[PDB]
Each structure stands twice: as C-alpha cells, then as structure tokens.
Design a protein around this ligand. Structure first.
Ligand SMILES: Cn1nnc(-c2cc(-c3ccsc3)cnc2N)n1
Ligand SMILES: Cn1nnc(-c2cc(-c3ccsc3)cnc2N)n1
Lengths: 546, 546
C-alpha cells in the first residue's frame, strides 16, 4: 500500500527540461546530432558534470570545463564550432525558460492533501551565476509544497547511484513498496524499480498522471479547480511594532518587493487574508497582513476613543515610520476598507495605492448626523445594535464557535438577517445553537478565530462602530479633497449590506478610479472567491502599484 | 530658562527653500520680478495656497488653481507666459532638489541629547503627486529625530495665525519663555516673539546656529563629528520565525529594498548592529538584524550539535524560505562572519552578496585536525578554553556586567590577553572586579546585553566553538569550490585575534574579492568605528548588491 510520492525536478515538476535545450541548440545551429549532449555526459561518473551534480564544484566553475568538452567533441566529429557560441548563454536561456509544470504540482498537492509524504529528488547544481535568483525563486515556490527536497549537490550523491535511493528511503521513513517514484530518465528510474518502488516514466504529463492516479487510486486528472495556497499560522514570520506606550500592532509578513498592507474587517484577523498572502508574495510583493487594533495579537485597549479613525490612521502611519517604510499599498475589507480610504484622504504621501473590497468610499454628509445616515438604510441596523456598550459583546462572546460559524457563510447559506436586529434583540436570535459548517471554512479555521478572540473578546472590535460622531467631524475636514492617487474599488454581487450600488458615485471623489467586480460573492470576499480576489488584486498591483 | 527648540522645515531643516525656486524660475525664464510669487500668495488667507496649507485641498487639486493665478498675474503686468511652462514641473524639481540641511539637524540632535524637547512646525500640504514618495522619505528621515511634528495641513491652522502658536505651546507643555523658535520667514517669527518666545531669523545656517548656541549655552557649531543614529530596542519592529519545532529565530527589521541579513559574533546581539541598522535602511535596504541561534530572543537549545555550521546554515535558509525571500545579502562579524562565508559556499543561490567584518575566509586544512590548527596559533587559545562544557559558562555567567565591560573595549583600553587563557585559568583572571566603562559603550548599552544574556546564558553561544571536528568534515566537501558571487572582506588594523594578515590568501578562493580596511579599529568593529563601517558597507552594497 502506497503512502509516499517522489518527483524529479527537470522534465517532471519543471518544464521544458534543461536536456531538451542542449539538443534544440544543435538543431538550431546545424551542429552534429548529440554533439552538445556528448560534451555534457563526458567522463561519466568521473567527468565535470558528475562533480558539478555531487557539489564538488559550482556551475560557474563548470561552465569553462563544459566549453572545453565541446571542443574535444567537435575535433573528433571533424566539425567546427561558431564564433559567437556561448555555453553560459545557452544555460541562462534554458533555466529562464523552465517554469513549474502546474498540473504535476497540483497532483503532488492533491496526494499530500490525502495523507501522502511528498518529496522532490533531484540531480542539481550549486548555482553562483549572476542570474541565480530566477532558479532560487522557482525552487522556493516548489519546495514549500513538499515534505522533503533532496538535492544531489547537497547530499554528495547522484542518480542513478543506489546510495541516493537508500538515502531517500531513510528520509521518507518508508519501505520501497510504499513509494511511487516519477522520473523522465529511465536510467534514474531503474534503481528505484530494483528496490521494489512503483515507478512512472514521465514523457507527457497527462499519461504520467493517468498512471499516477491508477496506482494511487486518487483522482488527480480532471479534478475541480483547486483553492489558492493558504497559510499555516505557525509557519509565518510574525512581526510586532509598539506604536505608542500601551499599543502594539501584530502582523504576518511574507515576500519581497513593494510593501502591501492588508487591513481586515469586523470581526476578523490577519488570517482572513490567508489565501491572498502566498499569492501576493509570489506575484512580487512584500505582504504585511495586520491584526488590526483590538484584534488577535495586537493590543486591545478598552476605551471607545482609542478606536476612532483619526487615531487608527495615525497609528498606521507610526507603524510605517517604525518599520522604516516611506509608503505601502493599502488594501482593506469592511472596516479595513473604510480605514484605507481615510488613509488615502489624510496621508496620500504614505499610500502608494489604495484598494477596497466591498466597502465603498463613504463621504461625510455635512447636513446629517452619522447616526441618522445609518438609520436611513435598513441594512445598517446591526451598526445601531453595536452602539450600546456590553450588549453585542455578551451575545458575540457567549459561544465563540457559534459566532464564527453563524457569521462566516457563503451567499447561498443564509443564516442571519441584517435588518431588524435591534427589534429581534440580537444577531443570532433566529440562528441555530450548533450552526452547520460553511463550505468556505474548515472546523480548524473556525477554531483559529475562536482561539484569537479568547484573548481580548469583542470590546475593541465593536468600539470601531462606536465613534460615528467623532469620525464624521474628522471626515468633514476632507470634504473639499479628492482621491488622486491610484485606487481600486472591488464590489461583491451578493454582499447585501455593502451593496455594489452603494459605490456608484465614487468617480465624483476618485475620478481615475479602477474597478473589479465579483459575481456570486458574499460579504466574506477573501474566503468566498479567493481565486478571483487574487486575480483582480495582482492585475491592479502590477499595472498601478509597480 | 530654555528647554524646547522649534524649527521650520522649508529654509531651516531642509534646503534650498521651495520659495527660492519660484523667484529663480522668473530669472531663468526672464519673467517679471515676483510674477510667480504673487500668483502663489494670491487671495491671502482666502486664496488657494492657504486652503492647500490648511489641508482643505491637496497639492494635485492646487496645481491647476495656481496655474490660473499665473495667467491673472501676467494679464495685469501686460506680459505673456511661455508655451512649454509647467507649474507641476517647477514644483517637482524644487521638491526633488530640496535636501536635509545636515548642520541644522545635528544642532537639533545635540539640543535633544542635552534634555531639550524638539519639534518641527511647518506650513506644508497633502502631497498626492505621482512623485510624493521623495518628500515622504525626507519627512520620514527628519521626523524620527524630533519629539513632535506639527504640519499645518494636518492641524487645519497655518503660520502666522496665532492659533498654531498656542497649539505648539500646548503640544510642547511649556511656557513661551522656555521655547526657541527658528524660522526663515520674519512674518512667521513675529507671533512667537509676541508671546515671549526666543526667536531666530534663519538666513545662512552658520549665523542662525551662532545665535542658537549663544541663547542655549550649548556648543552646536564646530563640535566633534557625531556618531551615526543608534537603535532604541522598544522602537523597533521585532520579527519571529519558527525554523523547526524547538527553534525560533528573532530579528529586528527596518527599511525597504533588497534584504540585508546581519549576523553578529560571540558573545553578541542584533544590538551589536545598532549603528548600522538606521544607516543601511536610509541607504535603501531592508535590514534584518538577527539574534543568532543561542542568543537574546532566539531559541537556545542545550545540545552542542545544534550549533554546528551545517545546521546553523540550514536554519538560516529555512528563515529565508519562511519569510518568502529568495535571497538576502549576508553580512557577518566574528562567528557571524564565519557562517556568512559558509552560506556563500553551500547556498550561493540564496546569497545575493556576502560581506565579512574581521573574520577572513578560513578554508579547511584536510591534512590537519581543526583542534591542531587552533593550537598552531597562540591568539586562538581562548577557543581551547571554550571547549570543556561548563568552564567558560561559569566564568562568563558569574558577573554579566563585568563580562561585557571587560570584553567590549577599544584597542587602546586592553583589558584582557587572548593568549595563555587556559594556563591563566580564565579570560578575566587578571581583569578588575569592577571594570571601567569603555568609550565605545554607555552604561545603558551594557545593561541591554546583561538583560539579554539573563535569558539563556552562555551555553548556546559557547556551543558555536564546540563543533570544530563536525565543521571541518563539512567544510572539506567545499574544498574544490570557489566563491564567485559578489564578496567583501573588511579588515580591522588592531584586531589582535582576527588579524588583517590572516585574510591575505583569500583571493585564491574568491578571485573577484573586494576589500575595505579600518585603521585604529579593534575586534568590536561595528561600535568601534561605526561611521567607517557604514561608509564601506553602503559603498559596496550600492555597487555590488544593487
Ligand atoms: C449607511 N451608512 N452611512 N454611514 C455609514 C457608515 C458605515 C461604516 C462602515 C461601512 C462598512 S464597515 C463600517 C462606517 N461609518 C459609517 N458612518 N453607513
Ligand atoms: C587558527 N584557526 N584555525 N581554524 C580556526 C577557526 C576559527 C573559527 C573562528 C574564527 C573567528 S570566530 C570563529 C572557527 N573555526 C575554526 N576552525 N582558527
């Protein structure tokens, strides 16, 4: 019975194969068949390439030795090499053109999801080329999805020597009959077969995957589109900044490039961006996913006034100052979306670009009290129930599991009505004691929110809604301004509180506004439609935020 | 008696003044004298510029209104404006050309160092230009050195209105007679004078500073060269990455740009880079200053084997993987310098560039035991004393204050001999019980190290030296390799253990090696010569590490 899957890198997890360039070069330059391939394998186990693959020498040391072998091969074949020929150029192009074979990675991901131990076993080199980062990035993206990465140049062993297979078996802590081994080189497949391992010769991906699903008994081909990579909280870099004596802000950090500050809504976490964090980092950005003030590992003072927009924005500016960041792209959702538009209005110097999911830019009505404006819209009744200190805290803190399971549901899962909340006497008055688990979340993900909210509860989070008059007075100072920095408004078709139509007049304040729209998407945008969110944010970041 | 100093931004802390471009443009374009300056102040307190300065409108909204005023001014003066004229271009150039007036900042720094409350009071705007980051960076660099930053566009008040001066006095929590106010605009100086504040009209910096030192009684002009900005531990962003179940690594993080990973030596801290962190971040780099394994807030397992180079390097690679970093520039000192050369040799793909302070690249001698190689050099006797578990821990942990005060001394301060340590029976056997405080450190800085070492002690740090045979076996695998990635070797003239001559043969292993040399510099390079270290590292980073 199988419980481990091993994949090669070249020609298996990454395509096109580097060997499938050496032959292409011969054809393009009209050189004798196999001329370059013979110079590559020259000397066999004693040759320059085996020394390179075992880690005895680096790729830059190997380049001239390979060039030397190319001359010896041409002298024997009675042919002459061109005047502009470069081994470095051939390998730079080959490595750069090599990309992840996506359906092969998805198959490995599906196998690991069903309990398999997955590993990459590869004959590779120590890359010291000026262009080494390209491969470094590819290896980083691939390695994270596997239990083990075994590189020949690191272990001092090479395929097909039998010692690497015994090393692989020891690393996996599995007998050979429990292991599937996928390779594009038949010679490298043989010693695994010899030990009793199930072996797959990879030519075209689809056939290799048909063979893989037949042997494992798990559907890998024609499967539904998978969700993006999520975050394991204990595998993240956790950051902490003291913004004032009693206030510390926590954030999760991933990637390199322009800083992208993610601001969640109510009653959420940095974890609400779990599907965006790996995607945005992979797209070339430095992600800073916040625990907003009053949440998770961030400080939660009890005073209502600590949660007015002016203070929250000032603290976000200090956060940037303390990290040494002159700017950040600000992306918000719900209450985070509201903060993000105010950051753009009051601190444009510090905001590289601004994006909001669901929350439209809501300007202050100078001729109406903010509480009257809330009252005029039946869907915003929950905000009035959130006003009296203690009332919503008691209902929300009573049963944390019930709170999150009731709130975090897709558009076709109900289970609460946001209108007549005060009349009904609560958010969960007509909700079950043990709500069913939404398709958007696992039991484990609910438990993360439960554990986070055990620290400070709902006082700090609910206080965000308890500064309406204060926020209105501050917002009135910005009534003559316009948002002229790059901006994105993303609407969700089925958000019945933050309706797409609420954003219709935004172009009056933000003339150069860009938009995104997600159909069949509820209030919990990031987890409802993660793939679509990622596609819209990445496209907008690459075009408007560098 | 004075205890507060207030400085203007334009024409005082930053030069040349933005107003000193509007007049220059008239002269360059042969436009009537004051034509552009009249369009600037047009409408006075009701005009577009006052609305801009009060924060009613943003700079991008103001640009066309200013352009409108330029036409009205030319129509009255019976002159015509050019066909290629652009207000945006004039202000983009003016802002970009404006840099920090360094001797004015040093004076503010010296005043704050002597107990003064310092503040920047400025008539500024909300900058939403595509080029706003330039000013954002300047404001970030300046603001950190002051207790308060009061911006007109943020407070809704403008100089010379008396309300901003009463706001300033309330912010400072000081009576007017306790305040010095420096401004280049006489009209803006008057209301401060009117309240009884000491006022300085700033034309040339030197005279303003002569006036400032006469009134404060503190030397500000002709003072010795100041040390670079240091770090206040509680003002830093603190990061934490779990690299394996029982191992977490702590780091301090500052700046944006290419990642620069700083690796300290024995028995140090991330704080040993305190003078490099703000400088390197200011030069355009993302600094990650580590607490190495066994130190400060990083995990400190007791096992000797947890501290061999192979494990330490593997953990540093995981650290990068977990942060989503494909590469980092690695800069090391002492034991950190040793790790950094091994990172370059075993993981060139992950090392953008490598730099070492004091520690030469020491290759393995395959024909000699590492302990024999140590014994052959009298200066490395302390490493033999560090071998027996418990012995050095007992002496080093006995009196922490004495440990750090004895170790951290400049080349002309002795107080220990590194030869015949085993014979003498310890490092501090001929050292005083209460050592004098070195000129390199304050009592407070010693106490930070004392507090850090109270957590785990010296077991983990001393274990770095207890893997000689293990490190030698691993290093022998790299004997056929060369370091071909960008590399910097920095030698310290007076380091009597890590002597500059020990690095003489490095070009045999690192042919393209770059060098730096610091005269009259001991073992504690970063704190001994911080200015010189910063100059060498920044120059090398900007040329070889992007
Ligand atoms: C109908 N309406 N008028 N004003 C508002 C309003 C809404 C929010 C809000 C919107 C999404 S999360 C918090 C905050 N402050 C407000 N004043 N809603
Ligand atoms: C004379 N000598 N031979 N080998 C060494 C040696 C030195 C160090 C070292 C050097 C600066 S901090 C630690 C480590 N490992 C070694 N093997 N020193």
């Amino acid at each position: 019975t199988l419980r481990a899957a091993v994949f090669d890198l070249d020609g298996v997890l990454a395509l096109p194969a580097v060997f499938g360039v050496l032959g292409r070069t011969e054809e393009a330059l009209a050189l004798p068949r196999g001329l370059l391939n013979d110079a590559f394998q020259k000397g066999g186990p004693e040759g320059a390439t085996t020394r390179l693959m075992k880690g005895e020498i680096t790729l830059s040391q190997w380049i001239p030795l390979m060039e030397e072998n190319c001359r010896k091969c041409s002298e024997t074949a009675k042919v002459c090499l061109p005047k502009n020929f470069s081994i470095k150029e051939i390998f730079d192009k080959a490595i750069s053109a090599r990309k992840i074979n996506r359906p092969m990675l998805q198959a490995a991901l599906m196998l690991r999801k069903k309990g398999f131990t997955t590993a990459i076993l590869t004959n590779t080199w120590l890359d010291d080329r000026a262009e080494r980062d390209g491969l470094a990035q590819l290896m980083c993206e691939l390695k994270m999805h596997f239990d083990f990465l075994i590189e020949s140049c690191q272990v001092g062993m090479v395929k097909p020597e039998p010692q690497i297979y015994k090393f692989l078996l020891d690393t996996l802590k599995a007998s050979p009959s429990e292991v599937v081994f996928l390779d594009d080189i038949g010679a490298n497949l043989k010693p695994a077969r010899d030990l009793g391992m199930v072996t797959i010769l990879v030519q075209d991906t689809d056939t290799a995957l048909k063979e893989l699903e037949k042997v494992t008994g798990i559907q890998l081909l024609n499967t539904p589109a998978p969700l993006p990579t999520s975050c394991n909280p204990s595998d993240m870099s956790h950051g902490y900044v003291t913004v004032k004596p009693r206030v510390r802000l926590h954030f999760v950090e991933l990637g390199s490039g322009p800083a992208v500050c993610l601001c969640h809504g109510f009653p959420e976490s940095w974890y609400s961006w779990r599907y965006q964090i790996p995607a945005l980092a992979q797209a070339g950005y430095r992600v800073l996913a916040m625990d907003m003030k009053g949440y998770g590992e961030s400080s939660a003072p009890p005073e209502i006034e600590e949660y007015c927009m002016e203070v929250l924005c000032k603290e976000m500016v200090t956060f940037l100052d303390k990290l040494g960041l002159s700017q950040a792209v600000f992306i918000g959702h719900d209450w985070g979306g509201m903060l993000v538009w105010y950051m753009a209005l009051f601190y444009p110097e510090r905001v590289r670009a601004v994006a909001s999911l669901n929350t439209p830019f809501i300007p202050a009505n100078p001729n109406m009290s903010p509480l009257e404006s809330i009252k005029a819209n039946p869907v915003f009744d929950y905000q009035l129930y959130f006003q009296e200190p203690g009332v919503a805290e008691a209902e929300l803190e009573q049963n944390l599991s019930r709170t999150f399971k009731s709130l975090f549901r897709a558009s076709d899962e109900s289970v609460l009505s946001m209108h007549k909340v005060c009349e009904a006497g609560g958010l969960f008055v007509n909700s079950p004691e043990e709500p069913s688990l939404s398709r958007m979340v696992t039991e484990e993900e609910i438990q993360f929110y439960v554990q986070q909210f055990k620290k400070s509860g709902f006082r700090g989070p609910l206080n965000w809604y308890r500064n309406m008059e204060r926020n209105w007075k501050w917002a009135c100072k910005s009534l003559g301004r316009k948002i002229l920095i790059p901006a994105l408004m993303v609407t969700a078709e089925k958000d019945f509180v933050l309706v797409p139509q609420m954003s219709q007049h935004m172009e009056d304040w933000i003339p150069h506004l860009k938009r995104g729209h997600i159909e069949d998407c509820g209030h919990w945008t990031q987890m409802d439609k993660p793939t679509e969110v990622n596609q819209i944010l990445i496209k907008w970041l690459d075009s408007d935020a560098r």
